[PDB]
Amino acid sequence: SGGGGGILEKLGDICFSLRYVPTAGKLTVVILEAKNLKKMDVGGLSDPYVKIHLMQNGKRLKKKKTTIKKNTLNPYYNESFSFEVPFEQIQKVQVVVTVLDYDKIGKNDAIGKVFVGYNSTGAELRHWSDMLANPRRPIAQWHTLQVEEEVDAMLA
Ligand SMILES: [Ca+2]
Ligand SMILES: [Ca+2]
């Protein structure tokens, strides 16, 4: 129950898998696809890429990013990323996933973001809990993107 703050924001959705291997402390995130993304270019679509941050206690510990897909609101990525998180800390971290529009000049604006892990709620918490309940198994799930203002207030 609960969560769902981004549902009516019409920013789009992201699908990714999570896998956690406790013995090795290996956390794997596969960015699969995004859909229904907000348009971010005047006269056009968006040039989306995805950023992943590992966080704890308001600090960005590690940063990864996908390749950029041009001129689409429904990008497919299928790009894998791994992090090292010891099992004693896996319930105390966040994985933050942000979709942005690449612009050749100017700060790249976020479309929206979500996080899973500590302090996550709703479908975000469910995905994380499913990952932890099933060591070694990747679990794929869709998530609704939420405005950065809101998500960042929860992460800070
Ligand atoms: Ca733009
Ligand atoms: Ca752009």
Swiss-Prot record:
C2 domain boundaries: 10-143
Residues recorded with modification Phosphoserine: S80, S82
PTM characteristics: Glycosylated.
Stated consequence of mutating D41G: Fails to relocalize to nerve terminals after stimulation of neurotransmitter release
Domain of life: Eukaryota
Compartment(s) where it occurs, according to its Swiss-Prot or TrEMBL record: Cytoplasmic vesicle, Secretory vesicle membrane; Cytoplasmic vesicle, Secretory vesicle, Synaptic vesicle membrane; Cytoplasmic vesicle, Secretory vesicle, Chromaffin granule membrane; Cytoplasm
Binding locations of Ca(2+) 5: D41, D101, D103, D109
Tissue: Expressed in the brain (at protein level). Predominantly expressed in rostral, phylogenetically younger brain regions, and in some endocrine tissues.
Outcome of substituting N108K: Slows synaptic vesicle fusion kinetics and exocytosis
Disulfide bonds listed in the record: none
Residue sites binding Ca(2+) 4 per the record: D41, D47, D101, D103
Assembly and interaction partners: Homotetramer. Heterodimer; heterodimerizes with SYT2 in presence of calcium. Interacts with SCAMP5. Interacts with STON2. Forms a complex with SV2B, syntaxin 1 and SNAP25. Interacts with SV2A, SV2B and SV2C. Interacts with RIMS1. Interacts with PRRT2. Interacts with DNAJC5 in a phosphorylation-dependent manner. Interacts (via N-terminus) with RAB3A. Interacts with SYT12. Interacts with calmodulin. Interacts with DNM1 (via C-terminal proline-rich domain (PRD)); this interaction facilitates vesicle fission during clathrin-mediated endocytosis (CME). (Microbial infection) Interacts with C.botulinum neurotoxin type B (BoNT/B, botB). Has lower affinity for BoNT/B than Syt2; mutating its residues to match those in Syt2 increases its affinity.
Function noted in UniProt: Calcium sensor that participates in triggering neurotransmitter release at the synapse. May have a regulatory role in the membrane interactions during trafficking of synaptic vesicles at the active zone of the synapse. It binds acidic phospholipids with a specificity that requires the presence of both an acidic head group and a diacyl backbone. A Ca(2+)-dependent interaction between synaptotagmin and putative receptors for activated protein kinase C has also been reported. It can bind to at least three additional proteins in a Ca(2+)-independent manner; these are neurexins, syntaxin and AP2.
Domain writeup: The first C2 domain mediates Ca(2+)-dependent phospholipid binding. The second C2 domain mediates interaction with SV2A and probably with STN2.
Homology family: Belongs to the synaptotagmin family.
Name by which UniProt lists this protein: Synaptotagmin-1
Organism in which the protein naturally occurs: Rattus norvegicus (Rat)
Taxonomy of the source species: Eukaryota, Metazoa, Chordata, Craniata, Vertebrata
